[PDB]
Symmetry: C8
Subunit: 185 residues, 8 copies
């Protein structure tokens, strides 16, 4: 055997867009307004000082009040906060990113060297990324019969074919809640 | 098998909300009022400088005095503090989050790679989350007969089914004081 | 074994306290804002007092944080109008329990403002070793020995095996 | 065992040019304008304060708005931003670099001492770089039959020739998405 | 096997009084006088900026000169320094604690998991404290026959009786110069 | 065999001169102008704030614009920059060093305790320096037949004589692109 | 043995007085003169900012010039410096301590757990201190026959008698240059 | 036999004097001139901000330009700098030390626990220092026939004699370039 690529995976990475979910910590920057950008000062990390997304899908932001952010992209949230701050600040220059990815994760467990949660973020997490992020497989992984649970199905995945034969069809884009289990040999 | 739907598990997790308990350390941000936000300076962390929730369920806040927070969400506390601070500050802009989740915890132990307490927080902690946060299982886990102690009942849980067949009915949301024990087989 | 569903710290000598006086950083952070609160906090003396500026010696041992907050506030009112004060503990040094034997991390565990039960302490010690005589754990409390089965606690959910640990308690997990 | 050059390797390294991709974190210096260079102050790292590249290929920048940066080099982005800031700022002195390389990566797994993703950056990553960055091969690497998966086809590489005899014909430039797999014998 | 109360051990611990020795590093706080409290600024640790006790028992303090501190309690040193500073500052508010306990120590050696010096401090150090601070005993510890050397006298101690039978008469307060030796089985 | 003095290998080092390559990060100090030396403040390290050398061999510098630095020594770049800054500041006092050596490197693998890339910097890196920098040989090194690939030609090297006989003849100066392989005994 | 005392050692520690050597780093505090106390600012450690003692036994100090310190005590040095600063500063309040003990050291090698040099400092270092500071002995230490080299003479020490029988006569004060070797059993 | 002192150990050490080499990083303190002492702020380390000695023997210093420092002592460099600064600053108070010893090094390989380079610094580094600086010998070390390569001549050294018997003639002072090899038993 040799290759068996997948430019169909080119697709879910093409339009890949993260959407904010509850428990995320947002970091809002208002240029020329350090009283807004760093209300607790400059030393603490943005995740220790950022805005928490509540379970009802909003975050509080000063002057404008509650802002619905769940299910929106960063650019939409940036656009929505900017337009509402315009009431209180003339021509606000605002950006928004995510200080802590907490709402969405995948579960990479089994015969990997580090098991555990991996966040879904603004960057695509494929099976390839998660296995390499979990630090590769142990010597005793059944790397021909990796189990991916996604939206109610199981799918068998052959990492062996992915890496030793370049069968890119074995790669998948991971979604919130997915389980990637590497059984023991 | 395949992944079987849980009418219970994903309705517990959309409605999922944390309520403050005694011993939590809260963090209160008052925009334009660094003398309230950071009375001890910008450099210490929010848990080293936050407001402790006392056994009686209150925390002290300056000017407004004792604030009853136990049993309330962050949004309910934000509103409570905002309305009371408005006596001393015109139109106060206030948010509240948690610097230290110390009041509520689940106990994850036995044949896990990292035994011990895991805090209950504003992010759901399911069995799947807790096992992954505990580093996964040891090679000698009786992982078909995990014991969940919850509300004075013992439930038996197959992590084998959850991760190798995708059986999401094997998942549970973990609650404060729950015990999740993984025996040796 | 069954399955059931269902605390005030008091300051002692050697505790390091941390007093916040809003709008008075000269009181809150006399040594600056970088050092941790335990490196700048007020030490509780053997006689049960701590020094606080302008008010002098404050008796704190045997009191709750709220009692110390109220005591300090009443007295600072002589020197500062309407003082806004809180007090918490930056180092829990006076009271502890001893968790030893076949646990993965043996040692002292602090008694704090948060209840520390047996269950808390064993998980805090990182669980039992594989050679723990875990059915016959010894708790020493107030001069009297007691038999604790963590087996029944975790294998069967028997919460009657749990106990709130107290200052001075010894929880010893033997080898079988 | 005599060493030789390479078609692929060296025609493409003197030209080597990184191009920004989505998810990268950019760092923009505007001399004499700390309100622009450091809106969140001076303590947090570049990647904690930098500008995120959005999935549509743009980044926001104050006053000049959205800026298309994907596919472009740092020098070009510096010129783009400089030209646009000149509307708002007299003679702006701008530089741009990358605080976090997150869009592009190679996968280096198998019998190397440190498996995992390696970022594609402004410095070339050749096979020789990537193996050394992984701490070399284990004692059990089939180091004459390494599998490079690039553009959907496999190529067998002899690290033994490369790393013991400096045969650069075995060295390749690694590209975003390449899998370099060291099988065990 | 009922637990035995120790005769004069909590009599000894309720009167427990640290007294300063040569080499201790003290920390003096003079409220409203940061020029005195933090002469080297407020970033270095109090032990990096503290006052050293000299062999002759004195420490230097600005304006008041050398102060005799060895043999005294913190509360006594505070009182001595305050009365002296009142010559140079009106109603000085002073506290004193110890940034480094360097003068006095016990030695905990043998079949414990962590051998070494243990500092004598304002907090009573009992055998039970020191053994627990050493991390417990190895499994080869002759733990029925521990040897306490104190003031030129040998004592046999049974940690086995202390920990498995709660015999608190086995516990002892440790003093400067004491040797606690845990032999091999 | 013998342990001789030296000739021409001394000028090779006494004339040793690093020259800047693409991807180096430079650090320019302008005394009395913290707005140029540290445009992003004083806390971030020089390599997080310094000036990247682009592929085309230049770095941008405020007010003087692009500056050719590849191939030049630090002293020459300092001269070049000073003369040009004199147009915007003058009697301008300027120094230049390298915050991150990223462009040039040697590769050290085999039976060393620490395979990997070693940077070529302003301090000469000899084989001995590389081997010691690589943690020392393993117990199973063929330290009589270490292979040095430099500019295509391969060369038997005997670390053995370099240390059990102090034969400085075997040692060599490492150059950018050099490979050094320590074979299994 | 019983814990028979060492009587000269009882009073040898009384006269214990460190004296400054070449290479030591001193830290001079001048209250009300942070330009003298912290000429490099408040952030770097004392040992990064201290005054080096030169090989001639002198150190430079601003305004007063060059100061003989070797062979002298901290309190002697403090008086020397205070008296000469009174020219340039009114009623100077001065203290001196060592930020880095680099000049004097004892060698603790052999069957100790952590072998290496141990600094001679203002705090006495006895054999008892040094071995405990070495975290104790290996299981194969001939702890009955430790060898102490001091001012040329040799001198047999029973750590066995010291620690298990309390024999303080086996303790000794370590001086600069002393070698203490725990033989193989 | 009789226990011997040494015939050169403490005049080579009593006259020991480091001299600056290329690649050293120097640290120049000008009291009352923070703009000269900390041009990059007070937070970065001395070695992150110090003055690099160029291969030609010189370092740049503001106002006075090139300063020849190689082969000079610290005291000499301090005078030279002071004198020329005096042209520009009224009576400058200057000290100089070394933030990074990068020019001169000894190599200690063989049956020591941590091989590698050891810098030559302002404090003497005898064999007795470098071994303990490597913690010490593996217990499989030919510690009777340790080879020291200095200035071309081999020479045999017995570390067993130095420590079992306190023979000081075995200990030697290490010079730049020296190689000290510990053979395996």
């Amino acid at each position: 055997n040799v290759a068996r690529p997948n430019m169909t995976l080119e697709s879910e990475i093409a339009n890949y867009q993260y959407r904010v979910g509850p428990g995320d910590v947002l970091n809002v920057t208002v240029w020329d307004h350090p009283e807004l950008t760093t209300p607790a000062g400059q030393y603490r990390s943005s995740s220790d000082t950022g805005n928490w997304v509540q379970p009802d899908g909003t975050m509080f932001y000063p002057y404008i009040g509650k802002v619905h952010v769940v299910g929106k992209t960063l650019a939409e949230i940036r656009s929505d906060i900017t337009g509402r701050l315009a009431t209180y600040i003339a021509d606000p220059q605002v950006d928004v990113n995510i200080a802590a990815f907490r709402s969405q994760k995948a579960y990479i467990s089994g015969q990997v060297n580090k098991s555990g949660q991996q966040a879904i973020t603004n960057v695509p997490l494929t099976i390839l990324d998660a296995i390499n992020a979990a630090g590769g497989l142990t010597d005793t992984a059944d790397w021909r019969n990796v189990v991916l649970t996604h939206n109610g199905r199981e799918e068998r995945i052959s990492l062996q074919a992915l890496m030793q034969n370049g069968d890119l069809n074995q790669n998948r884009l991971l979604y919130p809640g997915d389980i990637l289990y590497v059984p023991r040999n």
